[PDB]
Write a protein that binds this ligand. Sequence first.
Ligand SMILES: Cc1cc2cc(C(=O)N(Cc3ccc(C(F)(F)F)cn3)CC(C)C)ccc2nc1N
Ligand SMILES: CSC[C@H]1O[C@@H](n2cnc3c(N)ncnc32)[C@H](O)[C@@H]1O
Lengths: 310, 619
Amino acid sequence: PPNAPACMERQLEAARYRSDGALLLGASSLSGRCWAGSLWLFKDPCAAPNEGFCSAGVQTEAGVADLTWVGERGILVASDSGAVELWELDENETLIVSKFCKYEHDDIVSTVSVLSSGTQAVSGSKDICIKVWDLAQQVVLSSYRAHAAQVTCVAASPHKDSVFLSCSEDNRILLWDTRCPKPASQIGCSAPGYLPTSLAWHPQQSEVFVFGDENGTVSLVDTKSTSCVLSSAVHSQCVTGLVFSPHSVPFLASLSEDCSLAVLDSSLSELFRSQAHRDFVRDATWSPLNHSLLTTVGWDHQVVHHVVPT
Amino acid sequence: RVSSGRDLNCVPEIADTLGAVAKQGFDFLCMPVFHPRFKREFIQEPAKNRPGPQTRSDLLLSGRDWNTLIVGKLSPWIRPDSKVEKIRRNSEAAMLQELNFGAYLGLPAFLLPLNQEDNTNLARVLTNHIHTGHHSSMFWMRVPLVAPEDLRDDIIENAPTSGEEKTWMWWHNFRTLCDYSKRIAVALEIGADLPSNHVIDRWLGEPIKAAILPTSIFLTNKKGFPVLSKMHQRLIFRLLKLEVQFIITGTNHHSEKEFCSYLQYLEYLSQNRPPPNAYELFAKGYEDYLQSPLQPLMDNLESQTYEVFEKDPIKYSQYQQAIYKCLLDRVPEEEKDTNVQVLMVLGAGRGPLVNASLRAAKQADRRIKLYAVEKNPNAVVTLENWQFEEWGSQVTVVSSDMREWVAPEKADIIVSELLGSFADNELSPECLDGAQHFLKDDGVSIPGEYTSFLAPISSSKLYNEVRACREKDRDPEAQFEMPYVVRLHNFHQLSAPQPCFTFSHPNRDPMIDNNRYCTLEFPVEVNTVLHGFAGYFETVLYQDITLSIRPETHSPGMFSWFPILFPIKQPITVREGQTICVRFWRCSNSKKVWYEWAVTAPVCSAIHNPTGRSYTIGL
Ligand SMILES: Cc1cc2cc(C(=O)N(Cc3ccc(C(F)(F)F)cn3)CC(C)C)ccc2nc1N
Ligand SMILES: CSC[C@H]1O[C@@H](n2cnc3c(N)ncnc32)[C@H](O)[C@@H]1O
């Protein structure tokens, strides 16, 4: 393919499925002479991560820490360079062109999430700052410094254009609402537990979300409540991400640094486990075409397609 | 000129980054040796057996580049003081892995963060790495002026915003665990919201080797060039007196201007500092350099030792002025040609006071007869060469000890410069007392009075240097029981200087006793750690003519004397409002004279230098 990197870096950092079925990939080189990242589009998911069988491809300036779809052709990228990059697919969907590259964070942009309004997105970074972006005008609308440590994960509300979660290494889980004068509101267990690591709203209940900590515990939390609804020790190491299945009654896909993948039910009871990876499991995405498939990428350069018994 | 560096947390390729940073004008580069997001596993499989290199090769730069251009940075995911055990074990191994690789590259400095209160396990791992082999690389501790929690915005609604000095206690408790290691310095990080002057004044005494300046704290003038507030400029100006390396972190927020504009503003302020005081310009190269106090009575000073005495015109002009006024008061106008005064320079050295007494005689239009008594025979050769070629029979060089010299006649005036940093630390009382017999009953002593002043100081650097003065074949703590002549610089005065000992000449007392006992109490209105006592002195040559190295009454331009420093074995913590109570003794026997001192409040220290076991002044 044209303008396509000959090879992609070993550490696969993200994997996101588009509505039609194309798989968005994000790899970054964490070792070797060069420390950079790339962006890949795989209309054929079963051909990933082979670079010769990709639909589109481009390599970024620095590494790809976290990415997410912006509609059906935009790719928002959180780079190590302190910049939030937005890349767009051309009409041919064969090239990936850079839209804007705004260096607004002073350290690594660790997490990004597009708000439900589609035109705005929040970005968390190690600079202890959460920024609300305007994808149209390519400008930071607001810069919040409410945490005291590096922002670990930010997650936008499914249907609320002004609500988004955030957690940092200060053991704080902040529920945001830019409609308030003081938008941040510290939630979670009143007793300080282990550091939060991942966040995931429930795809149906606008008040329910899950979060995993550094100790491997996945917790079920309701925002209207102020105490844990339910928790379960799922992994032996830090929980990296949490993804919900697109079912009506959705399952929860948990992935950690223990090189394992787990799928729990609504009661956080284990229904599926996979040690297919040999390194850290970084992302997991459900197929919108077949709701029993779960594509996971890791630093071992594996793109495994898990059959989920549903 | 300013030494500066660029802090970066993302380096794609070292060759391109180091060149762009060098083009912008930085001298070194702060960068991670391993990838910041490359979390590694050391125990649990299969993440333990991660193939491939763990970082990039050392051959990307020359050994000369690593030794002088690259400053290491610990990975941000390394938390040795975590509460999860698994995170500790890996953070220990990861910190050792990065610290060993840092020493493998021969990096001159390494950055480690003090971003919380408990860094005890971090201190142990670093101490184990320091006590592994013998190296001299520095370890820069990244600690902010104000804590991150104390700098957050009040955006949370259910959690609104000595407690404001908490970051210094982070550093103090860290270096204490590491036993004041010489390889551990402070990389002081500056925030947009500067703290109290108390906290600022407290950091000044600490070994601040680097100053980190984020781009978010820079203001924007009308043109758009990055500037600072009137408070930040006052901070940068006092940082330049410590001669630190400034570090610029964060991305470019003044994207209209070139990124090197941040750097040009620092060189702008540096060349706009107040003109260097002639004392600072002259004594440059002696800041905090410990020197053994001179003993011109027990030893014979070398030629270049006398040469540093005479390079001070202000010192001898005051002596000339004091003798000038004393001549006019003793001989009236009608007796200006019939009355010849008998001046005796007791300790003439190479004859600067003899020349000053001659200039004071011509200025006063009076007749004098000079005796230049000097015990150092190597210096008497200089006096007799001066006496034969220029002075003539007016000056009578006497190569003897003033305490033993049998003078042919009595003296109208006796002039001496037998004063050290602590006034009487060269036994000027005992010398003038022995020479007191051949002074007329109405004879004038110049100086006629001197007084030593003491001030409690705080300087973890000076304490670390005295601590390094341990020598073989003597008491291991003997270095703490002796004073040092030193131009004090990186220190913090904890209270106003108070007088200590005082001597008057001629001593009309029938029972002459130069032994002294003085108890001083010092109000300390700040929290600090006492490390020693600074010693100054004031002396009265004649009437209004005075000399002083005491800071508040320091003689302008006089750079002859450095302050003296009495250390203490164990540093003493002092709180706000507490009073430091120190007691000094001036003991003496027939052969030796020495000082003993002890702190009695807030806590008690040991009596330092008992019987002169560690330090004596020779009679
Ligand atoms: C007459 C006299 C002078 C004394 C001076 C000192 C004194 O401070 N130094 C340290 C010093 C001073 C100035 C400078 C520089 F570089 F600025 F010139 C450098 N080093 C001793 C040095 C002059 C040999 C100590 C005791 C003294 N005793 C005396 N009787
Ligand atoms: C100008 S520094 C002090 C000078 O006084 C001299 N000096 C010190 N003590 C005596 C003494 N007791 N008798 C004569 N000269 C002395 C020293 O040799 C030195 O040159």
